[PDB]
Design a protein around this ligand. Structure first.
Ligand SMILES: O[C@H](c1cc(C(F)(F)F)nc2c(C(F)(F)F)cccc12)[C@@H]1CCCCN1
Ligand SMILES: O[C@H](c1cc(C(F)(F)F)nc2c(C(F)(F)F)cccc12)[C@@H]1CCCCN1
Ligand SMILES: O[C@H](c1cc(C(F)(F)F)nc2c(C(F)(F)F)cccc12)[C@@H]1CCCCN1
Ligand SMILES: O[C@H](c1cc(C(F)(F)F)nc2c(C(F)(F)F)cccc12)[C@@H]1CCCCN1
Lengths: 392, 392, 392, 392
């Protein structure tokens, strides 16, 4: 039971474990695409001796955090342990080795999407974005008198406007916390999935505005449901225009989208209740690799006045943290801690999705100063609400 | 088609329209209870000539708003138009007359629970609290190592500990935005509903801590589901202790509760995803009757520095609004408006449930200054998350 | 295994078999009511020796047939064979004896409601009315510009307007084919079922017009469904007014009614499709006891010119049938048959629910003359569409 | 926003809007087929400037009406407005232009199948046929002793007997109201849909009689349900023989068919209730383009004696209407109207699906003479029950 970087001879064993572990799994054509994102020592395998019984890798990503700051981010993916080798510590050993390599390589953060919610907390990952599904009964939906755009939107084939989607998405990712650079190879895959599959998904159409797009398709089994796979809007006007067009899908009963908790959609309608929350789940998980580099890198709210505290991360260091004029300075200290929390809690607070006070109520964040808690809450808040870019 | 205060002879016609309009409706024994809360000129009826075809009333309530400030609040309830008299403007005429009486009586706010989401916006009511149902698959739930109370909780009969529930609830309502004084007569009704009904609900039990209680019952049809009707916890320790006891209902598969978006429950567990959001809806709706009295009455966040603006409410006045040291001064002005919004939008922002930026994205709040928007957001935020007291 | 009229000592054994055979079965309080309708020799029981293993009876009823003619009608009911005595010919023997008594007593027709569709055909009964359930999605329902009554309807308690329902129902039954006289004791039972039952049905309300009424209640399990138990309208204006009021049940999603195929409801709306047919079944079954007395008694369409034919009923006689000026003369003959059909087919054609041509296509009605078939079709048609009065 | 006949360059924009608007939509291979049926100026498009945002066309069809008379019929199809251009009057403008062209071209009637029931009434279209789904629990089905054919039916592959289906269908359409000529290109499409699709429908089989055929297939998800796509029988013997064979599908639990209200199937069985009505909906919609040409063209019932009246169609002319010996003469007059109705009501009465009395009860047809109403009812009735040919 040895742990190594894979050789070319290991990859067929990895694709076998992939097919058996992941239901989304196409086959080794999307492998050319995603492999480019994996750097030279970005993968580990466990062999028994001798076949592949475990694998994990990271991709080179670019993540937007509050203040429109873009961090090099190690994106863990393709994580699998053979069903024959459970409870042997393989996941723990693979995560320890990748974290060592990520830290040494100079990444301030790592990120992942979690197949289950109980695994990655113990490895320092905290849920950092929230997926919010809205289902609109569009037969009753009337726009409020105040709603913009009372058309600049066109109904188009996705494949014929790749360049415009690419340009709108690039503008969106730079300005929104949670934003990820989407490389050419993931656009190739997005348009692949957008064409009809025999006994699979129906054709996708696009609604295209100068400052936004929506990709949608009719559900396989339900022909009265349109699923919005993705809506990226750089302006409020674009967002409202796109929703006017989606509510115009007159043959549909329901429009569903996976969005964020602060989606203004409900406020565009005379009946806010028509935008029903049908599902909520953790999106992106963050592990802060380097506490001072992460805390210094992001912007903080300008509204809160300068304050100083001492933050301890459990087995992650203790730091003099000074926050003012929307900037943090974060320096080593042995002075007494005023705030203690595990590494995962800091990742949950990093993009502004979770309030420090809510975590403090659960005892995940500990302080004897309620004023410092209100100050953390306000400082770590995000002006621009955090969204989920794409699963990886 | 005349609109008057009811006489004693009108009340049987009102109870008939009630039975036909409301499915929750017991009969005129809960009528003795709720009638005490209705002040002398707190009810209107519409007669055709000549039976009752429309009715509406308000109750005298006490609502906690941010800063632990308690406002006299007019609670609209028992609103009904006969199915024979729809589209005759009866609701509009009844609301106009009650609002006139409420304003003249000196109430700064009115409140209601909405049977549908598309009605009350046009009468100046904005949804001000959010109901969030969590369903816990308690068979998988393990408490986090950080969770307090790793018992001070007793399993009791509700009827034998009325006094302790009353005392814990009183402490909770005073310290939480959304809190309502619960009068003796609504405690009488709560314990009535807590006893088993033949072909109705199962018996309710209570979990009692010095600083919290939960009322729960097994579902009628589903014997593996326990429904928490109400959990009031004054301390984090009480909340965690009560949830340790609810997760100990070993014969149940699922625990469901209607709570608020900031309920720390998910953070108490090793798998946050086990606390699934199964339902979200508007709770309390607010109509600000007097803008300056409401805006001056509540506390604002101390973290945001002193600022000055001009707020216009559409057909509600224009005001010089100065906010600093957590207090607002709100005075008449004819100076140019920097912020415009309808009366309903102000009610939605009053308890801190909705961000000004989210409403601005929908064009419900209008400003040409993004800095003023961040300042409104931070100032109107609530340190203590807003909760829903009880339906009326 | 003897077949007799019951004695007083037989009735407890009959109520036992009733409880075990019928799920609708209240107990012997509705027995006082229905027993009055049973004439002196109107019941048979089968004893084994020695308990009751079979029973059947008829009631004295008054049935409206085309031409507003009212026939004495023997209504079979309370028919049951013990589960211990199936396949012993008990039903056949009980039906043969009751038919002998009914024929000898001078009834021209017998009638029943069938628990299953495959039993009573072989005893000469044909389905004669059609139950048609409409479910209206009332949230989309808009009345057509042409619809009358663009209120004369009141929302009332059934128990307080018994006399007005009685008077409207009496007018309806006399003018509609399928109409039955409803005696005092069946009004007693109707109002019993109209009050709320603990763990049973919700309270019933009434919509009362000078020329019509609807009884409705909210469904037990579904609180968004109102079930119309009964709507009797003497004029088109009443029918439309009552439906305007039912569509005003704003808290309901759906209104369901068991009506007839020619209910004009769909034509009152801008979208006829909103009145969905959710269920269709046979209502009243007729056995013609005396062919000449039945055929002479009813009115025929005045539009068809005088014609003469020879009708044979299989083991029921052969008759010279002359139809003109809406009257039939029906006299014995040994001349060659031009039309043959079983007794059940004549019952199906008697109230105009089933066309002769449709039965001829199935070979239930046989003729070598297609002109005679068109003539039968037109003559047996009913100006006033046939409806179902009440189950017995 | 201009409205024109499409050019070749418009057709790709039309196929895009088609794919997005219609879920049945194969792609531009069925386009070669259906395009032949579209005459030279039979299509309109709306451009924004500049892409296609709206389209509509008609096909040249041949519709059988009562009296076995075949009318040139303009069949509206491929009607779509882009979801970006709702509420701009595009449908109204496209329908006005096509109606102008259809009227000028000399079509007495237009027809369509409606995606929703609330659209086409306001454009003069009335539902003229009724779709009736029967589901037979074939495990209980026994044929009545009177049922013909107590085999002349063969189980065959559709593709190998195209010529025999074509010949049987041609005989059926000529003799049945609702019948449409089915051109070569729609037979090409029918056999395309009859072969198994990977992840789509199962193979179709045929039951072939000299005077009838049934096409059926096992349902995708339900393997105990056989769906009859089409059953055309020229004789009663063929219809019964085909149903004997379908009831012989011993591996099936249920047989479902979309048929008409007068399908004799239920009468072929000992238990009529086994043929359950699971669904009812409008089939073909008719707009009478020229009232006198339509009313003169069809046959009327010979049973009703000669009568004369004055019919007004709202904005459609007033006419002296004389009906006798199954023929109508329909001439201009300014004499007082005895009957008024909108154009849509006449289309609903044209094929005999809807009675004048039922429409009169809804006030869609207005007269002060009840005798004239009985006369209209009998005269417009159809000897041969109206059926639905095929969707377009
Ligand atoms: O589809 C993504 C993916 C696929 C494949 C493929 F199966 F095509 F070879 N290879 C991936 C790789 C690769 F193995 F390095 F190529 C890295 C990251 C994601 C990959 C994964 C699959 C499961 C978990 C989330 N996305
Ligand atoms: O149960 C509450 C209530 C009941 C009754 C009763 F039906 F017992 F006479 N009366 C109420 C009254 C009363 F009519 F003034 F007594 C006011 C407010 C709420 C009442 C309402 C009923 C429906 C809407 C929300 N709570
Ligand atoms: O409720 C009707 C009914 C009830 C009862 C009762 F159970 F109350 F004694 N007795 C009935 C009688 C009676 F037995 F003669 F009293 C006749 C007809 C219907 C009766 C029946 C019961 C099942 C079949 C249709 N209606
Ligand atoms: O399938 C029928 C149809 C298809 C197509 C196709 F998409 F193949 F090019 N073209 C049609 C045309 C055509 F566009 F003129 F070719 C006319 C009428 C029906 C057509 C339509 C499609 C939706 C509404 C009812 N039948």
């Amino acid at each position: 039971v040895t742990l190594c970087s894979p050789t070319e001879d290991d990859w067929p064993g990895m694709f076998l474990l992939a097919a058996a572990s992941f239901t989304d799994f196409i086959g080794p054509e999307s492998a050319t695409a995603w492999r480019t994102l994996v750097p030279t020592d970005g993968a580990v395998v466990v062999r028994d001796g001798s076949e592949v019984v475990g694998m994990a890798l990271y991709m080179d990503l670019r993540l937007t955090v509050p203040g429109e700051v873009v961090l090099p981010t190690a994106g863990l993916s393709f994580v699998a342990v053979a069903p024959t080798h459970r409870r042997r510590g393989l996941l723990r050993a693979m995560c320890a080795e990748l974290h060592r390599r990520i830290a040494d390589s100079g990444y301030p953060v790592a990120a992942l999407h979690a197949s289950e919610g109980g695994i990655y907390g113990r490895f320092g990952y905290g849920p950092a974005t929230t997926l919010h599904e809205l289902t609109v009964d569009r037969r009753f939906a009337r726009f409020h008198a105040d709603a913009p755009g009372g058309s600049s939107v066109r109904l188009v084939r996705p494949t014929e406007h790749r360049g415009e989607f690419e340009a709108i998405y690039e503008r969106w990712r730079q300005q929104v916390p949670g934003g990820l650079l989407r490389p050419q190879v993931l656009w190739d895959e997005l348009l692949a999935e957008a064409k009809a599959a025999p006994g699979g998904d129906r054709e996708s159409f696009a609604l295209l505005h100068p400052d936004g797009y929506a990709l949608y398709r009719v559900d396989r089994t339900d022909l009265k449901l349109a699923r919005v796979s993705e809506l990226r809007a750089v302006t409020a006007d674009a967002h409202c225009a796109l929703w006017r067009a989606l509510i115009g899908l007159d043959s549909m009963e329901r429009i569903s989208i996976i969005t964020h908790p602060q989606d203004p959609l409900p406020h565009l309608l005379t009946d806010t209740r028509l935008a029903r929350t049908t599902w909520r789940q953790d999106g992106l998980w963050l592990r802060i690799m380097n506490v001072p580099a992460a805390l210094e890198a992001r912007g903080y709210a300008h509204e809160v006045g300068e304050f100083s505290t001492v933050l301890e991360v459990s087995d992650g260091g203790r730091f003099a943290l000074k926050i003012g004029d929307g900037r943090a300075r974060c320096t080593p200290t042995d002075a007494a801690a005023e705030i203690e929390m595990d590494r995962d809690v800091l990742g949950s607070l990093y993009l502004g999705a979770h309030r420090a006070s809510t975590l403090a109520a659960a005892n995940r964040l500990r302080t004897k100063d309620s004023q410092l808690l209100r100050r953390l809450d306000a400082a770590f808040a995000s002006d621009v609400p955090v969204q989920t870019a794409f699963e990886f």
